[PDB]
Amino acid sequence: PNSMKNIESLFDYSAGQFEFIDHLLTMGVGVHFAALIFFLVVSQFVAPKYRIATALSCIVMVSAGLILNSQAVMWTDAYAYVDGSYQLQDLTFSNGYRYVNWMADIPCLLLQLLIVLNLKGKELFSTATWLILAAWGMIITGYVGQLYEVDDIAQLMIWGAVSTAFFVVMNWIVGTKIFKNRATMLGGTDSTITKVFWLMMFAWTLYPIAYLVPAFMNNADGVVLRQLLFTIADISSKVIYGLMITYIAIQQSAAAGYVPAQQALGRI
Ligand SMILES: *C/C=C(C)/C=C/C=C(C)/C=C/C1=C(C)CCCC1(C)C
Ligand SMILES: CCCCCCCC/C=C\CCCCCCCC(=O)O
Ligand SMILES: [Cl-]
Mutate to test the pocket of ligand 2, among 20, 25, 217 (most ligand atoms within 8 A of CB): 20
Q: Which ligand neighbours the alpha carbon of 47 most closely?
A: 3
Burial environment of residue 124 by CB neighbours within 10 A (0 to 12, 13 to 18, 19 or more): middle
The DSSP element (H or E) to which 108 belongs, if any, is helix 96-116
The structure was resolved experimentally with X-ray
Give the 3-state secondary structure of residue 125: helix
Report how far residue 212's alpha carbon sits from residue 207's, in angstroms, rounded to the nearest whole number: 9
| Residue 234 · residue 218 · CB < 8 Å | no
Report how far residue 145's alpha carbon sits from residue 124's, in angstroms, rounded to the nearest whole number: 31
Beta-carbon neighbour count of residue 41 at 10 Å? 9
Give the 3-state secondary structure of residue 3: helix
Is ligand 1 within 6 A of the CB of residue 163? yes
Q: Whose CA is nearest to atom 2 of ligand 1?
A: 102
Q: For the chain, how many structural domains are there in total?
A: 1
Is ligand 2 within 6 A of the CB of residue 20? yes
Resolution (Å) of this entry: 2.3
CATH number at residue 227: 1.20.1070.10
Q: Who's near 164: CB < 8 A, 6+ residues apart?
A: 138, 208
Burial environment of residue 70 by CB neighbours within 10 A (0 to 12, 13 to 18, 19 or more): middle
Is ligand 2 within 6 A of the CB of residue 17? yes
Chain breaks after residues in the chain, where C lies over 2.5 Å from next N:
none
Give the 3-state secondary structure of residue 80: strand
Task: Output the CA angle 51-104-207, nearest 5 degrees.
Answer: 110
Nearest to 107 by CA among 134, 140, 145: 134
Is ligand 1 within 6 A of the CB of residue 107? no
Indicate the DSSP class of residue 217.
Answer: -
What CA–CA distances, in Å, run from 82 to 69, 89, 216, 230?
A: 24, 10, 29, 28
Q: Who's near 62: CB < 8 A, 6+ residues apart?
A: 32, 33, 36
Nearest to 233 by CA among 241, 224, 222, 244: 241
Atom of ligand 2 nearest to the CA of 235: 2
Beta-bridged to residue 86, according to DSSP, are 13, 81
Domain boundaries, position 45: 1-268
Report how far residue 39's alpha carbon sits from residue 19's, in angstroms, rounded to the nearest whole number: 30
Is ligand 2 within 6 A of the CB of residue 231? yes
**Terminal CA-CA length for the chain:** 52
